[PDB]
Design a protein around this nucleic acid. Structure first.
Ligand SMILES: [Mg+2]
Ligand SMILES: [Zn+2]
Ligand SMILES: [Zn+2]
Lengths: 312, 58, 345, 81, 49, 41
DNA sequence: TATGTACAAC
DNA sequence: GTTGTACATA
């Protein structure tokens, strides 16, 4: 449809397949392949039970990669039921991905910075760590080892003195594996993406089933001023070829039209003549051409249910 | 080309065949898609009507 | 018309009348109102007092006075001093009035810039030609016998309802309706207007008519095929646009105002079919023979004659007797009308 | 019961001035049990009723201008939550 | 909107715009009649180009 | 979105709070039932 | 000055 | 629906 949609979908596909398990790929791809998708229809497509679909939806909703829309449906055969639809709000998901990527990178950066700092001593018996500054005030009279204030036991130097290089590799590994996300985000920022809604998402619907019980339509209540949190987002050309005969007819019609107007515009009798002496106002060539044609032909031969509707 | 009024919750659309005239009635899910299909259909039907009118001229 | 001829968006236009009084919130906009809503001083409604302050507070850049022959009145001239305006323009077809206040316009809005000949624009196809006429309806003896004894204030109602005028008006309306014409009938007397309207079963408009009803009537008279003719009064004597009107008939008239005659004739000078060959609009003035109305009729057309219009006298309507039915055709009906009208007198 | 996105100007009448607002009709908040249920009056007929979740109220109170985990983690349909 | 055409004008269009003739000869007898072609041509972007 | 803007990252969303989702007396009666409502042209 | 008529407001 | 006020003419 549009280049923007393809790149956004690719970013969503990459994130799910890499940072999530397997079933999450199935769930999100189903609602990306289709528009807003009913819960019942989603279960039939993936052939998974409610107990298995629930955990996937909940985790995806937490990260705001999928949005929920509940509305009442009125089928004539059965009583009114509440249906749940799942779709994707690109502005929400993209913002969530950007925040998480920054947080993950920052956390590794902070861990690398923290690791480069001197280690803090820890007490084995009570497992209460002490920083270098805090351990310096625990020195004993003989000044041999730091003694725990509680246990009164020598302190043991903590690990992580050798990990100074491992974390650098981890950050290098992540930035290489996470490169596609950054590249896709750069293009997204360059353009501007419209926020989707249940009604808007329905414009690209590919029905999953033939007789799905869920009526995939948005019929908002009339004049309903109620608002739910996060419920809204920001001629004919006729041609006329005029043949030579038609032009003659048009002239004839013009003459007839002029005659009709002239008769209607005729002055009344009382205005035509000055009425002063009247009483009180109270109360055959065809053979000629054929013989020529025959002669010229001889010359050539010689020489040679009821529902309201409107008309659109 | 019969289309339900925009003031009704239904999004149904019917095409009636020229003569028990053939009727093909379809229900849409989004009004935006319904309008887009309606405009394209109207152009084809209107153009064919003009072509038929021209043919009937002579 | 304003929204049509120029590109001024509706958001910048506001109308200040008795129905609605909202004002434009845009930095610069338009206000179209009436003198009656701007000249009142004694008592103004709380909703209309705010509008007047809104009009007065701002320094307007242009003021247009339509039908400027009423601005030099005793109170209407205050609209020129209260509402500040840099440039004042006055638009009117007739620049005459009975009193001598006409010259007051010199120091109020300014002098007369341009004037156009009526005939010059008539021969160029801009305004429709008119074959004016003045029909002489002889008053019957039964009614005329009371026309002498009665006083002046009661004579007016007595020679306006004479039976012969009813016959003349009905015949002319039928003749022109068969001609596919839109007719307008004027009457300065409200009682005669209603009586004529009910007798012929045709709509009428006058002072007590609400704005919505008269607007609906005018629109129907323009586009509705069934409504061929409508009865107007002093309210529609000027500044009403009826492009479909092509014939005008008068049964009553103000005392001696020459301006009203010209303004009434204006309703038909803008006929849509004013360019088709042989077209001729009509303007009938039904008067009572040997009555004080003839004194005013010869005085009420002293301005049109100046412009070049020629008034001819019709003493008889041909083919008027052969009409099947005529109002007050028998003496019984005529006597009943005399007793009915004299009751009011 | 309305945010009044546009309010009449104090200096001059019939001259509206735009104020920070969203023009959403406010509910008639009532205390049902230990929850706050808001009822909306539709312009054009029972009023719309929904439970004002504490998260919604917490978000709103944070916009005002010094002194269960297991269930929601997996499954737990909205009725259970 | 009604646009009036004439046989002389149709020939003039072909002479002044050879591209129009190219699209005319290869489609009028094969796919759709002449009136449809001109209605489509005016509504197309080529008529604007 | 506010937190993303503080970090210098362009946020592809907006706060929902910013979404601004906001005579009787007839004179003539003898013509009743005859006048069709030509309200528009 | 008196008298019609139309208009705005309460 | 009625009362206080203009405008346009004798
Ligand atoms: Mg005018
Ligand atoms: Zn210890
Ligand atoms: Zn608000």
């Amino acid at each position: 449809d549009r280049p923007i949609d393809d790149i956004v979908k690719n970013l969503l596909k990459f994130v799910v397949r890499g940072f999530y398990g397997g079933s999450f790929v199935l769930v999100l791809d189903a609602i990306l392949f289709h528009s807003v998708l009913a819960e019942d229809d989603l279960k039939q497509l993936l052939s998974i039970n409610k107990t298995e679909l629930g955990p996937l939806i909940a985790r995806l909703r937490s990260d705001r990669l999928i949005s929920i829309h509940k509305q009442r449906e009125y089928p004539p055969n059965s009583k009114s039921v509440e249906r749940v639809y799942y779709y994707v709000k690109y502005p929400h998901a993209i913002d969530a991905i950007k925040w998480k990527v920054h947080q993950v990178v920052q956390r590794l950066k902070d861990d690398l910075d923290k690791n480069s700092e001197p280690n803090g001593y820890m007490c084995p018996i009570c497992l209460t760590k002490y920083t270098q500054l805090e351990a310096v005030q625990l020195l004993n009279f003989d000044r041999t080892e730091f003694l725990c204030s509680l246990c009164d036991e020598p302190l043991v130097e903590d690990d992580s003195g050798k990990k100074n290089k491992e974390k650098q590799d981890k950050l290098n590994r992540l930035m290489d594996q996470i490169q596609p996300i950054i590249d896709s985000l750069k293009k997204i920022d360059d353009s501007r993406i419209e926020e989707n809604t249940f009604e808007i998402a329905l414009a690209r619907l590919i029905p999953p089933q033939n007789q799905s019980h869920a009526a995939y339509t948005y019929n908002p209540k009339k004049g309903s001023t109620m608002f739910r949190p996060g419920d809204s987002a920001p001629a004919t050309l006729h041609i006329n070829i005029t043949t030579a005969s038609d032009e003659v007819a048009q002239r004839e019609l013009q003459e007839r039209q002029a005659e009709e107007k002239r008769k209607q515009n005729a002055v009344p009798e009382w205005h035509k003549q000055s009425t002063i002496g009247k009483t009180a106002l109270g109360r055959e060539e065809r053979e000629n051409e054929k013989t020529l044609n025959d002669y010229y032909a001889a010359l050539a031969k010689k020489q040679a249910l009821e529902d309201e509707f409107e008309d659109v | 080309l019969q289309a339900t009024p925009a003031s009704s919750e239904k999004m149904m659309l019917r095409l009636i065949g020229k003569v028990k005239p053939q009727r093909h009635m379809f229900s849409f899910n989004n009004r935006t898609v319904m309008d887009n299909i309606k405009m394209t259909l109207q152009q084809i039907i209107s153009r064919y009507k003009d072509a038929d009118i021209y043919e009937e001229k002579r | 018309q304003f929204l049509q001829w120029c590109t001024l968006q509706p958001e910048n236009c506001a109308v200040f009348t008795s129905d609605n009084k909202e004002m434009f919130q845009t930095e610069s906009g338009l206000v179209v109102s009436t003198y009656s809503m701007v000249a009142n001083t004694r008592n103004r409604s709380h909703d209309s007092q705010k509008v007047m302050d809104f009009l007065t507070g701002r320094e307007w850049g242009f003021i247009i006075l339509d039908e400027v022959h009423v601005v030099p009145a005793a109170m209407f001239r205050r609209v020129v001093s209260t509402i500040a305006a840099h440039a004042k323009l006055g638009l009117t077809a007739t620049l005459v009035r009975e009193d001598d206040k006409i010259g007051d316009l010199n120091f109020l809005i300014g002098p007369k810039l341009y004037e156009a000949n009526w005939m010059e624009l008539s021969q160029k196809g801009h305004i429709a030609n008119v074959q004016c006429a003045e029909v002489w309806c002889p008053m019957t003896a039964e009614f005329y016998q009371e026309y002498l004894r009665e006083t002046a204030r009661k004579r007016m109602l007595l020679y306006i309802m004479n039976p012969t005028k009813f016959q003349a008006c009905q015949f002319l309306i039928q003749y022109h309706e068969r001609r596919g014409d839109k007719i307008i009938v004027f009457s300065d007397n409200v009682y005669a207007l209603q009586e004529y309207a009910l007798k012929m079963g045709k709509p009428f408009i006058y002072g007590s008519t609400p704005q919505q009803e008269r607007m609906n009537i005018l629109q129907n008279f323009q586009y509705n095929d069934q409504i061929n003719t409508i009865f107007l009064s002093k309210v529609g004597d000027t500044s009403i646009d009826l492009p479909e009107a092509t014939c005008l008939i008068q049964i009553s008239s103000h005392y001696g105002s020459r301006r009203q005659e010209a303004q009434r004739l204006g309703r038909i000078l803008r006929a849509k079919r004013r360019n088709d060959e042989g077209f001729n609009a009509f303007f009938y003035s039904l008067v009572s023979k040997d009555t004080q109305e003839m004194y005013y009729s010869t005085k009420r057309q002293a301005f049109l004659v100046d412009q070049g219009y020629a008034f001819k006298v019709i003493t008889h309507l041909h083919g008027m007797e052969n009409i099947p039915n005529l109002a007050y055709a028998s003496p019984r009906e005529r006597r009943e009308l005399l007793q009915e009208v004299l009751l009011k007198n | 019961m309305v945010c009044e996105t546009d309010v009449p100007s104090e200096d001059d009448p019939t001259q509206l001035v735009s104020r920070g607002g969203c023009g959403n009709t406010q509910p008639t908040i009532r205390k049902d049990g230990l929850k706050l249920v808001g009822s909306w009056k539709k312009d054009r007929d029972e009023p719309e009723l929904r439970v004002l979740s504490t998260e919604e109220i917490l978000n709103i109170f944070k916009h005002i201008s010094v002194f269960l985990e297991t269930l929601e983690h997996n499954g737990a349909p909205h009725h259970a939550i | 909107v009604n646009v009036n055409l004439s046989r002389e004008k149709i020939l003039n269009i072909f002479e002044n715009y050879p591209i129009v003739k190219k699209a005319y000869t290869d489609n009028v007898p094969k796919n759709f009649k002449e009136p449809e072609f001109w209605a489509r041509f005016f509504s197309s972007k080529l008529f604007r180009k | 979105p506010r937190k993303l803007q503080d970090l210098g990252l362009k946020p592809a969303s907006v706060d929902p709070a910013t979404i601004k989702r906001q005579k009787g007396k007839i004179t003539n009666t003898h013509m009743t039932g005859i006048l069709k409502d030509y309200s528009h042209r």
